[PDB]
Every structure is written in structure tokens, then in C-alpha cells.
Design a protein around this ligand. Structure first.
Ligand SMILES: Nc1ncnc2c1ncn2[C@@H]1O[C@H](COP(=O)(O)OP(=O)(O)OP(=O)(O)O)[C@@H](O)[C@H]1O
Ligand SMILES: Nc1ncnc2c1ncn2[C@@H]1O[C@H](COP(=O)(O)OP(=O)(O)OP(=O)(O)O)[C@@H](O)[C@H]1O
Ligand SMILES: Nc1ncnc2c1ncn2[C@@H]1O[C@H](COP(=O)(O)OP(=O)(O)OP(=O)(O)O)[C@@H](O)[C@H]1O
Ligand SMILES: [Mg+2]
Ligand SMILES: [Mg+2]
Ligand SMILES: [Mg+2]
Lengths: 352, 349, 353
């Protein structure tokens, strides 16, 4: 009975927003799909299958990780990551099932069926399914249609309540092109709205995928790649993803510096402060093609190197406060510098 | 709810902001794209254009600006293939890849991959004159139904694509008949002015007659492309008229505006020019080579000595320049640059 | 019994004459061969092979598409349309039968053989067979002989019940010239019978191609192009297509204007109406060499562009009706047609574009 109050007081959409920012249309559709599971309007005879498409770096595995953290407490037993990049050969179906009878290796058992029987409510993610050979997809079509497995010993494993996600990268640049095209049309009409001063109607930058772009472009490509129409017809949910916008990327820079300041405060009580020009230069030091990995390890390289060289020669006492500021030589146009806030509010420089 | 943009700033304005003197061609392609975007065009067959004109008249840039209008500065929506590579019969393999059992089979076809990644992409076949006629034979399916089949047997879809082919066939004939029609129009306007009923002159564009389109140009089109099938699949055969003097002035003004914009962005130097410099730059116009004949002649009378000025440090930042005609060469021909200083003093460079 | 009843109440000729207009000898000969196939009056060990010869933009590809749509309601599976422009070189035979064992596409198999393996009663349309290399055409020797084909994995396939239709424009100019000459001769004889007061005989314009023109002109150019006097032997019929006359082109103009009226009504509730001068101005600028395709483009720029523009400035509300009217100032009789709104009180209002 308490699960209803925990659901209403703590909706998952806010928490999935607060872990991963951006992809608000994707967050909304996975929130609607998960909400249409537990309130009694669902299919028990079909396992819930999520098919996560999108580009790189922007976040699919972490989003599904937070989904499994939401539905299951433990991230070990209820959270299984099968790497379909490993399975690229015909006999790897044995790793799905087991050895044939009359042959050795049958005594070890089947790994996936043991994972699904030991943890029936677990969340299983398939990473890099594009390189999987077609026959392991066929042994997955057995689960994808029926949800029941038989191993070489003959034992029966039911997998309905388990939650299945496949993360793929087919037509990532294509969905990126449709997102960028609809965003370009939105920008070109929004500049007309600014010119006509039409501020009465609220403007949302939660731009979603168009309805007729996905059937014109993406569906014949997926029919050519997956080779089965029944695979594309049997899917419970397909979630498409979009490249990050401009202000959301500034929020991402703020988010990365936010956990870096949180880690400094938790380890040695250090409070960081940042400027908008630092965020501008970091967005300049970002790569669109592989997403937020660029901004994550760029913030890891830029600011953490300077505080690490400060800690190596003990220029960072605990309990003080730091500011990061673009250097005045590079503020014309990039080198950034650290400044210590004194009790007299004097900006101490560094000589490392 | 983008149709309001189509009400406020159509294709004709965007093309006339980049392409001048081709108002008939702009009107034709704008009407066809307007018919396509309003849901008023059959989606069974793709829209096919064939631009015929003299060189340097703006056919390739009209195709490029058309692609910019559709896909908004996106690299994928503009599939450009130069057909000048496709001079032999086996070059068709470059479209579709090799058959099974052959080298390059797993790579697949190039145009097929580019049209699979974007089916509504604008495909520009540059220089369809320059390809072999048997290479154009593969265009029959792709223009009739947008149905191209791969090396591996997969079939792509091009039902909503826009194909634009540039050519130089009958360029001498088109240019000669256009200048002859402008000449007789000028003569008949002057003759009607002799009784003071000739201020109408003509329309802005020369209406190329259907009799001239069928009895003259079409035999050369049939003779070079060797096939009435390929000409039948072409939805709009769009003719480009050569420039007359009024838009030659505007064209020289556009080039000089670009070279004034090359400064002031990184040197803070302005460039100002009179009308007689525009007259003596229109004077060096070659009919055979088109606007490109102007485009690399303008610097020959404007920028090169200006380049020498940048080698002689005669242009600091903040100068005010003026290109005028030489007094001794007023034959009409060299030009000379001057700097006007803040106390209204002219210094000849 | 039920299929015989269905063929009795409406033959193939009525359905395809609805879908394709003109070409009466072509549809008659094709429907006769199909009727021989359907009623069990044919040698089952030989597949039925057609070569569609005629001008461009006449309807050969459309007629064979309509025939394959008549055979199966599912035209995705039982209609194998292979385009011969991909097959301009000899090694493109590897697209048909697949690669030999030991090469990159061997496990994929032959592309034609797998589609014929899915269904062996399919209509295979070899589009533009003039364009393929003749050594590629040498594989249709064993396709047309006993209806068998060997895959790259050694598994032969049977195609005894399949129907193979090729289309080409070999001798397009000769067929069009001879058909125009025969039309001129028939019109001369008709006006002579009018001048001789002979009009009691119903002489329809079903012009037939003589055997002497087939054997004198079409056969040497066919043997010069296909370069083998054994490929043409296995072709069961040479179906002949003719350029349109005036009334057929008028019916084509009315057909496409009916199509645009149907689209306007079913998408935006717009009723269209036109006069006979509309058909005259949509037939006058006709090119024979582009056939029906030329007529289509004449409907496209003269009328449909004005419809799209008049939609763009928002002059076409739901339920309104338009009349297409020839221009008075071009009564030049490229002209122009005007769109006139008819209101509730049957008044004519010209619309500005
Ligand atoms: N939008 C984001 N917000 C916050 N952190 C992010 C974001 N994107 C990536 N990260 C961080 O970077 C890591 C990258 O993992 P993530 O699952 O987000 O990437 P991905 O795009 O799914 O990866 P891959 O392309 O390899 O499938 C995350 O674990 C997280 O720490
Ligand atoms: N309408 C125009 N008027 C004047 N100059 C133009 C116009 N369009 C383009 N130009 C300029 O002239 C150059 C030549 O144009 P473009 O490359 O389109 O050639 P073209 O007319 O298609 O001829 P060709 O087919 O022989 O290449 C362009 O690079 C541009 O700088
Ligand atoms: N006789 C006709 N009756 C009705 N529609 C026709 C006719 N001929 C052509 N069409 C229309 O024009 C299109 C072109 O026809 P189709 O491709 O069959 O012509 P074709 O003469 O066989 O072609 P090709 O140029 O390859 O020889 C058809 O799909 C149809 O829409
Ligand atoms: Mg990931
Ligand atoms: Mg060019
Ligand atoms: Mg055809």
C-alpha cells in the first residue's frame, strides 16, 4: 500500500531529469511507458522490451541504469549488462543456452537462463547489438515472441516480469539529422516570433521526433538491417534520442563542475565557483559527434589537472574557496586560472 | 504551422538574393517546389530538373541554393555527383557497387548509400553533358519511380527526392537566340518609341518559344543524349538566359561588395567605388565564359594592385578607399586607387 | 468454376482497359495469351515470354505492372521487377545467379533465384532489356527454354509456370514512323470514303502492323541489337505498342484531370470542372517521343502550379468548386488557363494569383 504513496510523492520523471539532463522527450516517453506497467494496465504475458536508439555519449546505458536503480534497489543482482558486442559468432548461441547433449560443457549450465531464473525481476541491457550475428538474434526472437527458454537439460525458464532493453546505434546520424532539421525550422520560426514579438504563447524547446520522418527514413533502414519485419512489429517500446542543445550543454557543464565541486567538498572541504566564459570555452572544447563524453573528460582534464598540481605542491588548503576564471590574455579570444578567496577577499594566484 | 514562412518569404526571394538575371528559371523552379511542398505533387515519381545554359550563368549555384532551401545547411541532404567522372560504360558501377563475388561488393553503392541515408535529399548531377550516354541509362528507373537496386540486391526508395541535372548542351544556340531576341526586342521598342508608343519594351524575362524549344534545341538534346526515354523522364527542362548590361552592373556590384566585405572584417578597412568603375568592369565581360569571366577579371583591375598596397603598407586600418579611372587612360583603361583622408584630402596610392 | 465465372463476367481486357487506355492490339494479344494460360491450353514445360516493343511513354511497363497486379493481389511478393540498366556489363550476371563458391557473396545466393524460390508463379518484368549487355541476356536463354535456373549454391530452380515480360524501345523511331504513316493512310482513306459518300461501314481505328514490316525492318534491327538469333526465338510473343491518336490523348488528358480532381476532393474538398478547350490546350503541345509522359507534364505546369499557388494564398476553402477556362487573349489558337471560382449563386469569380 505504501508503494502508491512512494510513487505519488516521488515520481520517477524528476529523478531521471536530475540524473541525466537533456533528452526530455525520451525521459517523458520512458516515464509514460514505466507508468503504464504498475497501475494494472499492462500485459503480463509479454515482457517489457525497450529499444533504445540514439547517438553516442548523450546517455542511454546510464539512463537505463537509473531506471534499474529506480525499480530495483541493488545494482548488482537486478542489473545485468549483456554485451552483444561479444556475441558475434554462430556457436555463441551456446552461451545463450548451453552445450548440446552428449557433449562436454553441459555441466556448467546456461548463463542467461541462470541470470533470469535467479533474478526474475531483473533488468537486462544489451549493449552494441548491431554487431550481433543474425542467429543469436533468432535465439533472442524466441524470447522476444514467447518469453520462455529451454536449455539443453530441458529445464524451463519464464522471463515475463524481467525488463529487457537493447541499446543500438543504427541510423544515429539520421535521427540526429531529423532532430537538427526540426530544430533549424524551430529556430527560423522563433526568430520570426521574436521579430513579431509574439510573447503571449509560451515557447518550448522540448522538440520531439517528427511523425512522418520516422516512417520515411528510419523504418526501411531498420527493415534492411534487422531483416525481419516481425522483429520491428514485436517491440513494446522504441525510444529515439536527440543531440544536445546549446543551453542544455551549458547546464551540462554546470552539472559536471557541480559534481566536481561536490567531490572536492566531500573529500577535503573545497568549494568551487565558476564563470559563464569558462562554460563557453568548455562548450568550445566539446565534440558533437560523440556527445557528453567529450565534455565529461574535458572538464576532467581542464580543471582537475590544476587542482591536482595544486594539491601535489600543497597550494590548496582545506576549508578555503576557489574560483576558476579565464585568463585576461585569453579573454580577448585558451588558458584558465585558479584563484583562492582569502578572508580579506584577495584573489590569490598560483605559482606551480 | 511552416507554411506561414512560405507566406512571408518564398523561394523566389531567397533565389533572387543569390541568383540575378534568371527570373524565368527561378520562377519555374519556385513554382515546382511550391507545388511539391503543398501536397500538390504526386509522390509516385520524383521531381527532375535539367538546367540548360551557357557557362557561369548560375546553374550549379541555383542547385546548391535549392539544396540549402530544403535541408538547411545540412551536408547529407545535398548529394552532389559530378558526372564528368562517369565517362565510360563501366563507371555505372560507381553508382551501384560491384556484383556478388567481386572486389568492393561489401562496400555497396555510393549513390545508393547516400540516398538510403536521406531519401528526400536533393541530388545534383553536375555536368550531365559530360557523362557517357550509357551511364545515363541507369537514370531511367531513378527518374521514373525512384527505384534503384543495389549491388547486393536491396532496393532503395527515392519517391520524394529532387534530382537536378546541369548541362551545357545547345549553350551557343541558347545564347545566340537569346541575344538575337533581345536585339530584335530592343529594335522594335525603339521603333515604337519613334511614334512614342514604346516605353513598354518587353517583359523582364525573354519568353523562349515552344517552337524554338522543339524544332531547334530538342534535336541537339536527342543527338547528344541518344535517347528520347531519358528526355521523357525529365519533368522540367529549365532554360537559363544570358546576362544583359543592367544585371552585369549588379553583378559587378555584388563582386565588389564581396571584396569590400573581405576587408572591414579582419582589417577594418572600407572600400567605396563610383559608377564609372562599374562601367569599365562591365566592359571586360566575355559572353562565352559568363559571370565567372567577370569574377576573376574584377580583381585583375581592382584587388591585385590593392594586394600590392598590402605589400607596400599603404593601407593601415581605418582607411577610406576609392577606385577611380586613370586620367591618362580616360582608348575607352587602367584604374587607380586613392585614399581620402579625414580632412578631405585625396592621396593617390 | 468460380474463377471461370469471374473471368466470364469481366475479362482481363476490361480491367486493363480501365487501367491503361489505347493499345488495343497489345492488350488483345496479351489477354489472349493469358487466357490460353489460365484455361489450361498451353504447353506447361515452357514459360510464357513477351517482348514489349513500342515508343517511349506509351504504357509497356504500366501494362505489365497491371498484368502482374491482376495475377496476385500482393504485388510485393509475386511481381519480380528487375531493371536491366544495372546489367550493362557481363559480370552483372553474378547478380542473377549469385557468386561461385569461395567468393564474398556465396552464402547470400542469387537474387533472382531466391525471389523465384519464394513463389514460382510470379511475373518477372525485365525492364528496359534493350540496355543490358547481350551476354547478360544469354541467361534468359535457359530461363525461357525450359524455365530452369542454376543458383550459385548448385540448386537449380523451376520457372515453368512463371510469366516473363520484357519491355524495350528497340526500333522506337521505326515503329512510331510506320504507325504515323498508317494513321495518315487510314485518315486519307476515310476522307476519300467521305468524298465517295461511303459511310455505312463501321471501320474502327484498330490499326494492325503488317507481317512484312515486322520481317523487313524490325527483325534486322532486333538481330543487330540483341546480336543473337536464338534469344529472339524463345520469345513467345512480340507485343506491339503504337503512338496515341487524338481521341486517345484527349481521354488521357481527361484521365489525369480526373485524377487531380479526385485528389483535390479527397484531400481538401475541392470540386473541379473543365471544358473541351482545356483538352485542346492540354493536347496541342504534344511530343510523340515522350508520349503520355509529355501530356503529363503539360497537365503539370499549365494547371497544377496555378492550383498550388491559389492554395498558397488561401483562396480555396472547403466545398468550393473551380472551372478551368481557356484564355481569351490566347484565342494563339505556351498558353495559359484561368481558374474561376463558382459560388453558391453560380456566379463566376476569377481568382488572382
Ligand atoms: N547527459 C548526461 N548527463 C550526465 N552525465 C552524463 C551524461 N551523458 C554521459 N554522462 C556521464 O558519462 C557516462 C557515459 O555513460 P552513458 O550511459 O551516459 O553513455 P552512452 O551514450 O549510453 O554510451 P555509449 O555510446 O558507449 O553507449 C555516464 O555514466 C555519466 O557518468
Ligand atoms: N546568378 C548568378 N549571377 C552571377 N554570378 C553568379 C550567379 N550564380 C552564381 N554566380 C557566380 O558565378 C560562379 C559560377 O557559377 P556556377 O558554378 O553555378 O556555374 P554554372 O552557371 O552552373 O556553369 P557551369 O555549368 O559551366 O559550371 C559561382 O561560383 C558564383 O560565384
Ligand atoms: N497508355 C497509357 N494509359 C494510361 N496511363 C499511361 C499510359 N502510358 C503511360 N501512362 C502513365 O505514364 C506512366 C509511364 O508509363 P510507362 O512507364 O509504362 O511507359 P513506357 O512507354 O512503357 O515507358 P518507357 O519510357 O520505359 O518505354 C505510367 O505509369 C502511367 O501512369
Ligand atoms: Mg552507453
Ligand atoms: Mg556548373
Ligand atoms: Mg517503360
Amino acid at each position: 500500500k505504501r508503494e502508491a504513496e512512494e510513487r505519488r510523492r516521488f515520481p520517477l520523471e524528476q529523478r531521471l531529469k536530475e540524473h541525466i539532463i537533456g533528452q526530455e522527450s525520451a525521459i517523458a516517453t520512458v516515464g509514460a511507458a514505466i507508468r503504464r506497467k504498475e497501475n494494472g494496465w499492462y500485459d503480463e504475458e509479454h515482457p517489457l522490451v525497450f529499444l533504445f536508439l540514439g547517438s553516442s555519449g548523450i546517455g542511454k546505458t546510464e539512463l537505463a541504469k537509473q531506471t534499474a536503480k529506480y525499480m530495483h534497489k541493488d545494482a548488482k543482482k537486478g542489473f545485468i549488462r549483456l554485451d552483444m558486442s561479444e556475441f558475434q559468432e554462430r556457436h555463441e548461441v551456446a552461451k545463450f543456452i548451453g552445450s548440446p547433449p552428449g557433449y562436454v560443457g553441459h555441466e556448467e549450465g546456461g548463463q542467461l537462463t541462470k541470470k533470469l531464473k535467479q533474478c526474475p525481476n531483473a533488468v537486462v541491457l544489451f549493449d552494441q547489438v548491431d554487431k550481433a550475428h543474425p542467429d543469436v538474434l533468432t535465439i533472442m526472437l524466441q524470447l522476444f515472441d514467447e518469453g520462455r527458454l529451454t536449455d539443453g537439460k530441458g529445464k524451463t525458464i519464464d522471463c515475463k516480469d524481467a525488463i529487457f532493453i537493447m541499446t543500438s546505434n543504427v541510423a544515429s546520424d539520421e535521427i540526429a539529422q531529423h532532430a537538427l532539421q526540426l530544430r533549424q525550422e524551430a529556430l527560423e520560426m522563433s526568430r520570426n516570433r521574436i521579430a513579431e514579438n509574439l510573447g503571449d504563447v509560451q515557447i518550448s524547446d522540448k522538440i520531439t521526433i517528427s511523425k512522418n520522418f520516422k516512417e520515411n527514413v528510419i523504418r526501411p533502414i531498420l527493415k534492411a538491417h534487422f531483416r525481419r519485419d516481425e522483429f520491428l512489429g514485436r517491440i513494446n517500446e522504441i525510444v529515439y534520442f536527440l543531440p544536445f542543445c546549446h543551453s542544455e550543454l551549458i547546464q551540462l557543464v554546470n552539472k559536471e563542475l557541480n559534481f566536481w565541486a561536490k567531490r572536492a567538498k566531500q573529500r577535503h572541504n573545497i568549494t568551487l565557483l565558476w564563470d559563464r566564459e569558462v562554460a563557453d570555452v568548455l562548450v568550445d572544447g566539446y565534440n558533437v559527434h560523440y556527445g557528453a563524453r567529450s565534455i565529461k573528460h574535458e572538464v576532467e582534464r581542464r580543471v582537475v589537472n590544476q587542482l591536482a598540481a595544486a594539491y601535489e605542491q600543497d597550494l590548496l588548503p582545506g576549508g578555503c574557496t576557489l574560483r576558476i576564471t579565464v585568463e585576461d590574455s585569453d579573454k580577448q579570444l585558451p588558458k584558465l586560472r585558479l584563484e583562492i578567496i582569502d578572508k580579506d577577499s584577495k584573489t590569490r594566484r598560483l605559482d606551480i
